[PDB]
Design a protein around this motif. Structure first.
Motif, PDB file in Angstrom:
ATOM      1  N   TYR A 162     -22.559  24.328  21.587  1.00  0.00           N
ATOM      2  CA  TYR A 162     -21.819  24.425  22.839  1.00  0.00           C
ATOM      3  C   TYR A 162     -21.618  25.890  23.181  1.00  0.00           C
ATOM      4  CZ  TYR A 162     -18.532  24.382  18.923  1.00  0.00           C
ATOM      5  OH  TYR A 162     -17.942  24.585  17.715  1.00  0.00           O
ATOM      6  N   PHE A 163     -20.875  26.160  24.249  1.00  0.00           N
ATOM      7  CA  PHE A 163     -20.849  27.509  24.807  1.00  0.00           C
ATOM      8  C   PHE A 163     -19.509  28.270  24.782  1.00  0.00           C
ATOM      9  CE2 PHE A 163     -24.013  24.735  26.984  1.00  0.00           C
ATOM     10  CZ  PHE A 163     -25.051  25.076  26.168  1.00  0.00           C
ATOM     11  N   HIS A 164     -18.461  27.629  24.275  1.00  0.00           N
ATOM     12  CA  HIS A 164     -17.192  28.322  24.064  1.00  0.00           C
ATOM     13  C   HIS A 164     -16.982  28.769  22.621  1.00  0.00           C
ATOM     14  CE1 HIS A 164     -16.768  23.983  23.889  1.00  0.00           C
ATOM     15  NE2 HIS A 164     -15.762  24.139  23.034  1.00  0.00           N
ATOM     16  N   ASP A 165     -15.973  29.611  22.475  1.00  0.00           N
ATOM     17  CA  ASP A 165     -15.632  30.291  21.246  1.00  0.00           C
ATOM     18  C   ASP A 165     -15.023  29.324  20.247  1.00  0.00           C
ATOM     19  OD1 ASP A 165     -15.533  32.686  20.010  1.00  0.00           O
ATOM     20  OD2 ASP A 165     -13.717  33.379  21.071  1.00  0.00           O
ATOM     21  N   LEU A 363     -23.398  34.028  27.853  1.00  0.00           N
ATOM     22  CA  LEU A 363     -22.373  34.242  26.854  1.00  0.00           C
ATOM     23  C   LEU A 363     -22.614  33.312  25.678  1.00  0.00           C
ATOM     24  CD1 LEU A 363     -20.220  36.058  26.826  1.00  0.00           C
ATOM     25  CD2 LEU A 363     -18.829  34.631  28.252  1.00  0.00           C
ATOM     26  N   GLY A 364     -23.468  33.704  24.737  1.00  0.00           N
ATOM     27  CA  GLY A 364     -24.021  35.040  24.654  1.00  0.00           C
ATOM     28  C   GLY A 364     -24.313  35.354  23.198  1.00  0.00           C
ATOM     29  N   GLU A 415     -14.234  31.532  32.911  1.00  0.00           N
ATOM     30  CA  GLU A 415     -15.444  32.292  32.592  1.00  0.00           C
ATOM     31  C   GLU A 415     -16.796  31.601  32.845  1.00  0.00           C
ATOM     32  OE1 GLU A 415     -14.794  34.038  28.659  1.00  0.00           O
ATOM     33  OE2 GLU A 415     -13.845  35.717  29.716  1.00  0.00           O
ATOM     34  N   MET A 449     -15.961  39.171  32.505  1.00  0.00           N
ATOM     35  CA  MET A 449     -16.103  40.570  32.907  1.00  0.00           C
ATOM     36  C   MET A 449     -17.469  40.965  33.458  1.00  0.00           C
ATOM     37  SD  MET A 449     -15.975  42.535  29.141  1.00  0.00           S
ATOM     38  CE  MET A 449     -15.578  44.143  30.184  1.00  0.00           C
ATOM     39  N   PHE A 450     -18.497  40.159  33.217  1.00  0.00           N
ATOM     40  CA  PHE A 450     -19.803  40.556  33.749  1.00  0.00           C
ATOM     41  C   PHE A 450     -20.113  40.032  35.144  1.00  0.00           C
ATOM     42  CE2 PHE A 450     -21.119  37.310  30.493  1.00  0.00           C
ATOM     43  CZ  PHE A 450     -21.523  36.320  31.367  1.00  0.00           C
ATOM     44  N   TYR A 470     -12.345  43.307  28.582  1.00  0.00           N
ATOM     45  CA  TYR A 470     -12.550  43.814  27.224  1.00  0.00           C
ATOM     46  C   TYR A 470     -13.320  45.013  27.742  1.00  0.00           C
ATOM     47  CZ  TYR A 470     -11.210  39.229  25.798  1.00  0.00           C
ATOM     48  OH  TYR A 470     -10.507  38.065  25.605  1.00  0.00           O
ATOM     49  N   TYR A 474     -16.241  45.151  23.965  1.00  0.00           N
ATOM     50  CA  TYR A 474     -17.536  44.479  23.968  1.00  0.00           C
ATOM     51  C   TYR A 474     -18.456  45.574  24.556  1.00  0.00           C
ATOM     52  CZ  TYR A 474     -15.694  39.905  22.658  1.00  0.00           C
ATOM     53  OH  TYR A 474     -15.099  38.862  21.953  1.00  0.00           O
ATOM     54  N   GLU A 506      -6.779  37.524  30.045  1.00  0.00           N
ATOM     55  CA  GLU A 506      -7.221  37.859  28.684  1.00  0.00           C
ATOM     56  C   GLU A 506      -7.438  39.367  28.501  1.00  0.00           C
ATOM     57  OE1 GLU A 506     -10.602  35.788  27.046  1.00  0.00           O
ATOM     58  OE2 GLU A 506     -10.006  33.823  27.821  1.00  0.00           O
ATOM     59  N   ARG A 564     -17.762  36.557  14.657  1.00  0.00           N
ATOM     60  CA  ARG A 564     -16.468  35.945  14.345  1.00  0.00           C
ATOM     61  C   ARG A 564     -16.192  35.982  12.846  1.00  0.00           C
ATOM     62  NH1 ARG A 564     -15.318  35.315  19.852  1.00  0.00           N
ATOM     63  NH2 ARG A 564     -15.308  37.513  19.174  1.00  0.00           N
TER      64      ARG A 564
HETATM   65  C1  LIG Z   1     -21.046  30.386  22.296  1.00  0.00           C
HETATM   66  O1  LIG Z   1     -19.677  30.575  21.858  1.00  0.00           O
HETATM   67  C2  LIG Z   1     -19.406  31.859  21.458  1.00  0.00           C
HETATM   68  C3  LIG Z   1     -19.624  32.243  20.128  1.00  0.00           C
HETATM   69  C4  LIG Z   1     -19.345  33.540  19.708  1.00  0.00           C
HETATM   70  C5  LIG Z   1     -18.845  34.453  20.626  1.00  0.00           C
HETATM   71  C6  LIG Z   1     -18.612  34.083  21.956  1.00  0.00           C
HETATM   72  N1  LIG Z   1     -18.134  35.028  22.765  1.00  0.00           N
HETATM   73  C7  LIG Z   1     -17.345  34.923  23.839  1.00  0.00           C
HETATM   74  S1  LIG Z   1     -16.805  33.399  24.478  1.00  0.00           S
HETATM   75  N2  LIG Z   1     -17.006  36.077  24.421  1.00  0.00           N
HETATM   76  C8  LIG Z   1     -16.191  36.092  25.658  1.00  0.00           C
HETATM   77  C9  LIG Z   1     -14.907  36.900  25.498  1.00  0.00           C
HETATM   78  O2  LIG Z   1     -13.969  36.501  26.514  1.00  0.00           O
HETATM   79  C10 LIG Z   1     -17.518  37.328  23.815  1.00  0.00           C
HETATM   80  C11 LIG Z   1     -18.782  37.822  24.533  1.00  0.00           C
HETATM   81  C12 LIG Z   1     -18.568  38.799  25.516  1.00  0.00           C
HETATM   82  C13 LIG Z   1     -19.626  39.331  26.242  1.00  0.00           C
HETATM   83  C14 LIG Z   1     -19.407  40.302  27.214  1.00  0.00           C
HETATM   84  C15 LIG Z   1     -20.480  40.830  27.940  1.00  0.00           C
HETATM   85  C16 LIG Z   1     -20.228  41.899  29.012  1.00  0.00           C
HETATM   86  C17 LIG Z   1     -21.776  40.378  27.692  1.00  0.00           C
HETATM   87  C18 LIG Z   1     -22.974  40.932  28.484  1.00  0.00           C
HETATM   88  C19 LIG Z   1     -21.991  39.407  26.719  1.00  0.00           C
HETATM   89  C20 LIG Z   1     -20.924  38.887  25.990  1.00  0.00           C
HETATM   90  N3  LIG Z   1     -21.165  37.911  25.015  1.00  0.00           N
HETATM   91  C21 LIG Z   1     -20.102  37.376  24.278  1.00  0.00           C
HETATM   92  O3  LIG Z   1     -20.378  36.520  23.432  1.00  0.00           O
HETATM   93  C22 LIG Z   1     -18.898  32.783  22.379  1.00  0.00           C
END
Ligand SMILES: COc1cccc(NC(=S)N(CCO)Cc2cc3cc(C)c(C)cc3[nH]c2=O)c1
Ligand SMILES: COc1cccc(NC(=S)N(CCO)Cc2cc3cc(C)c(C)cc3[nH]c2=O)c1
Lengths: 603, 603
Positions: A162-165, A363-364, A415, A449-450, A470, A474, A506, A564
């Motif tokens: 999936y796509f969230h943290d 993301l990423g 996001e 942020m992007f 961030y 980041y 955030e 992480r």
């Molecule tokens: C898939 O589930 C996961 C697993 C591990 C990490 C994440 N990260 C997440 S949700 N964030 C969002 C923070 O609010 C970090 C993050 C920031 C980011 C910023 C830019 C500017 C770019 C170009 C690429 C980025 N990539 C990122 O990953 C997600």
């Protein structure tokens, strides 16, 4: 359908949360074909409800399991429940549940953060035991509210991505209950408080009803009947009242009576006289200039998952109260209602949010195999269903929380990527439809942020500006000096672009408790402090900034990855709620201010 | 009185451990003067029950409070409970609790760890709402079990001191509940299971009734009636049986019916068919020598204190199962009955222990000169009243736990100083009383190391020798070579002195998770590993050693001092249940042995 929060008068409950149920995995997915729910699960073991199934057993194989699991338990229906309405309710079932009372399929639900219930009277007999079997699914796909993708391997098994943290906890995360109603019954209610320059004001009732006449009465804090209304469909009572405020949070009680010649149904709906809306670059609660503090939170804790927990709840609020939070956001899913009841009771301001997270594919952080759909909005990836599934998710949250005064805002998502094409075509309808569901509160969509002030194609459609930023972390990693420029530059650039009020939903940096550095660099405690110092220095030099919520109240668990370290370490507190040296910096700022009040572009 | 555990048959509970209650301290001690039970508590904050109160609010001043506190809460009597016996029951209130139903005092209990219940029908009206105030007190004195000494400084500010490690957490630690029976009802049952070289045997049964004829049937695992019985206070049933056995704990179910001419009552009691006896230096379960592995545990976790919790219980049991533990001791006080039902069902062997720790004035930390009575067994300190309150603690414990097949022995006290004369005077009559109370299980008193084979005056009076030993750590610090010579010489002295079975019920060392060292010295993970390993080598050499229970399952909170680095760190797991490397050492030793069976003196 219609959701009403159970309370106990012409209705009473056996909570079935009595924890130990029988539990099993169905690694063969033969469970429905073999009709497991007709007899006792075999090869089971005890599990507690409510809590996530993942971490109760200290087993990785269960923790990372994907597919269906089975819950089962038996329970005597109370003798006194006569010929009455019997109603089985789940506050949540994470991702999907199907329910069998003995052999009768009584229920079905997709969504993991909101209640669903059914009238079970015809397959139950008061005074007797009845089997309860639940089938629970934790799989995510494109029309699901967080979306995701299940890769089945060649070897037989599923594996979720999936796509969230935050980690994909699943199970019965909240209270279940059997409850009782008269055959006359309130089943729906809605209430709106209008306010007028702070002298006097009016509230509207509207109320769908099981067959019967409604006497509507609003009570004092001290139970003196100061508002009365008649009519089973609508009223407005203009009394000169005592308001719901942030320091203190006063509440009224509006009893609701539905009448038949045989029966009576009595309902107390707590009510906070409060007005919310935006004026220019200001946020207004009871026509006042607010300033938001507090965090993004999660429902996460050792051992239980996202499972609800009273002690945890009481402790965290103690911690928020102490440190000066006046507000928070229900990060990336609807929380258990108890948090909201507490917020109302205590006057705590809440940006309420849906599970719509991870619409984003940029993301990423991938060293790995790409696919991954090419177009974000496609029949392949985010499609017609998905906007509809999504629509339904927004109904329910609003169905549930429209009556909670503590909620001063709705959040549509968090996001999503708005650089691909359908991104304005997807988001415009839901933005419209949101206000057609509740026009009493402003609505936002939280911003990654992007999709920055020059590229984001979606922000005008919403009322308030919610940014996750961030800048030293980041990008500009470690560089407060240039990070401050980019940030301000980009905050000013938003202020002129949209002339909306801005909240940072955030801002935060991964920090390991106990890591100390004379060089004040990344992952150290000192760095977190310097970085929060700086973001702060910068909101004090911007007029449009009216809200600040820290990335994470406490460290939570994530998907396993290179970015992480045993989870997201961006908490002000560790997961066991021990405070990092930054709890004491936020402490000063948050209690030093005047309540709800930005500084003098200084202090 | 009589204590049976509430279950749902004709019988019915409303949990009410719904845990949001109102709460406040009483610092000036006004509570009973001003009849606080009479009006809703003032200046009252929300607290979770069950839970310890000390940790839910992150406030040192509440945590370290000594004195009185109040819990208050409104409830609904189910309308259905019409002709009904309505009982209000508390599973534990830590130390003393006094209870009002709406200006009607119904209960009072002293003890922090066993239930008390009152028949409250005449002070409640079915279908109306009631106010319930509890006054809970957390102070200890020479007549409380356990004992302590409150010290009031010159200002009248009370400060509790006590002679045991673990933190005095207090509050309503376990569920509260309203429950129902008919006016004919079983209120006490007693079962004794007999067996003979294991092919078939009987269960004596004794049954006390509220106004009825009793009948009795033994239902199988798959629910078939394996035998029948008539008569009131006397019966015996014979059977060709699947015994309850350490691995798996097979359970029949005894079904008790009290019949009036009009009214009827039904009570299911789980029965495990098994014998427990000492034969020389062996401990026999179903006539087979058994060997204990596993822990002394505590009731402790973050936030909730000693508050009971389902997720925590399921998780710790997955941990102990994984690690190969076949048993534990309820260190230090009676545990939540839920803990024993679990044991019953999974075939876990338990040593059940009173709250009588602290009899000793000789485990001081250093050098705060004062000041403690100079004679332990004296009218000032541990006197006739104390012995009564101790006998009472024994009675209450056995009344609760006597039908638990998982309980294989009773421990009467932990580490009393037995050197002073009159130690023997004080314990002999308790030993005697305990056997009379339950003739079916061996009995013990856990022994502190400075009462050693040559100085101890009490151990001949009990059946099994349980030793708490710390050579290498409190004495011979860091020196395994010489710790090992002393351990073995002492264990042999005990074997030759008493020729009883020896269970080492505490052995362990403080180990800071993550402190690693090539020197294998005192507070590191490697030392914890080498030390337990040395202990293990010696046990396997001594034939009277029949069990090993590592001192701590997990780290736990203690009162503050120079010896406890934020608590006792003798954990195998951290307080958040993370394994230290000794966890894998124990796992290999315990899963590698033949189940329930002493090693062959070799790897
Ligand atoms: C898939 O589930 C996961 C697993 C591990 C990490 C994440 N990260 C997440 S949700 N964030 C969002 C923070 O609010 C970090 C993050 C920031 C980011 C910023 C830019 C500017 C770019 C170009 C690429 C980025 N990539 C990122 O990953 C997600
Ligand atoms: C927080 O509660 C507190 C407060 C202060 C001290 C402690 N200490 C405790 S519990 N123990 C555990 C004994 O099983 C250490 C101890 C060992 C010991 C060994 C010998 C051989 C002798 C002669 C004297 C000893 N005295 C001790 O104290 C605990």
């Amino acid at each position: 359908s219609h959701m009403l929060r159970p309370v106990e008068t012409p209705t009473r409950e056996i909570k079935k949360l009595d924890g130990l149920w029988a539990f099993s995995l169905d690694r063969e997915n033969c469970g429905i074909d073999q009709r497991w729910w007709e007899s006792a699960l075999q090869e089971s073991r005890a599990i507690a409800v409510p809590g996530s199934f993942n971490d109760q057993f200290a087993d990785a194989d269960i923790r990372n399991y994907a597919g269906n699991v089975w819950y089962q338990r038996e329970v005597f229906i109370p003798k006194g429940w006569a010929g009455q309405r019997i109603v089985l309710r789940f506050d949540a079932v994470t991702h999907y549940g199907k329910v069998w009372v003995n052999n009768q399929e009584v229920m079905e639900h997709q969504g993991g953060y909101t209640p669903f219930e059914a009238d079970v009277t015809p397959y139950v007999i008061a005074g007797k035991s009845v089997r309860i079997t639940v089938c629970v699914n934790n799989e995510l796909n494109w029309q699901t509210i967080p979306p995701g993708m299940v890769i089945t391997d060649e070897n037989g098994k599923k594996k979720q991505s999936y796509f969230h943290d935050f980690f994909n906890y699943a199970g019965i995360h909240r209270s279940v209950m059997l409850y009782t109603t008269p055959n006359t019954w309130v089943d729906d209610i809605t209430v709106v408080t209008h306010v007028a320059q702070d002298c006097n004001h009016a509230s509207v009732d509207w109320q769908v009803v099981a067959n019967g006449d409604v006497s509507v009465e609003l009570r004092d804090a001290d139970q003196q009947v100061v508002a009365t209304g008649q009519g089973t469909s609508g009223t407005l009572q203009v009394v000169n009242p005592h308001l719901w405020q942030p320091g203190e949070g006063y509440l009224y009680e509006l009893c609701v009576t539905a009448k038949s010649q045989t029966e009576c149904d009595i309902y107390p709906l707590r009510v906070g006289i409060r007005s919310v809306a935006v004026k220019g670059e200001q946020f207004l609660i009871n026509h006042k200039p607010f300033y938001f503090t507090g965090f993004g939170r999660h429902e996460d804790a050792d051992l239980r998952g996202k499972g609800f927990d009273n002690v945890l709840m009481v402790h965290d609020h103690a911690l928020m109260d102490w440190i000066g939070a006046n507000s928070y956001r229900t990060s990336h899913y609807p929380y258990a209602e108890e948090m909201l009841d507490w917020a109302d009771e205590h006057g705590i301001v809440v940006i309420d949010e849906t599970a719509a997270v991870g619409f984003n594919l940029s993301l990423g952080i991938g060293f790995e195999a790409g696919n991954k759909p090419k177009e974000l909005y496609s029949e392949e990836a985010v499609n017609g269903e998905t906007q509809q599934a999504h629509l339904q998710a927004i109904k329910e949250l609003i169905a549930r929380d429209k009556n909670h005064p503590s909620v001063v805002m709705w959040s549509i998502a968090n996001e999503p990527d708005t650089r691909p094409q359908g991104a304005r075509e997807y988001f415009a309808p839901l933005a419209e439809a949101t206000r057609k569901l509740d026009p009493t509160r402003p609505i936002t969509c939280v911003n990654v942020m992007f999709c920055d002030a020059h590229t984001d194609t979606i922000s005008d459609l919403f009322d308030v500006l919610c940014l996750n930023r961030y800048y030293g972390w980041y990008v500009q990693s470690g560089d407060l000096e240039t990070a401050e420029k980019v940030l301000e530059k980009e905050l000013l650039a938003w202020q002129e672009k949209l002339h909306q009020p801005i909240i940072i939903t955030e801002y935060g940096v991964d920090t390991l408790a106990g890591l100390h550095s004379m060089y004040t660099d990344m992952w150290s405690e000192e760095y977190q402090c310097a970085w929060l110092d700086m973001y702060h220095r910068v909101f004090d030099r911007v007029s449009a900034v009216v809200g600040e919520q820290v990335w994470n109240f406490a460290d939570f668990a994530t998907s396993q990855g290179i970015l992480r370290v045993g989870g997201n370490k961006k908490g002000i507190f560790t997961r066991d709620r021990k405070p990092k040296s930054a709890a004491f910096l936020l402490q000063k700022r948050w209690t030093g201010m005047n309540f709800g009040e930005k500084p003098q572009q200084g202090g």
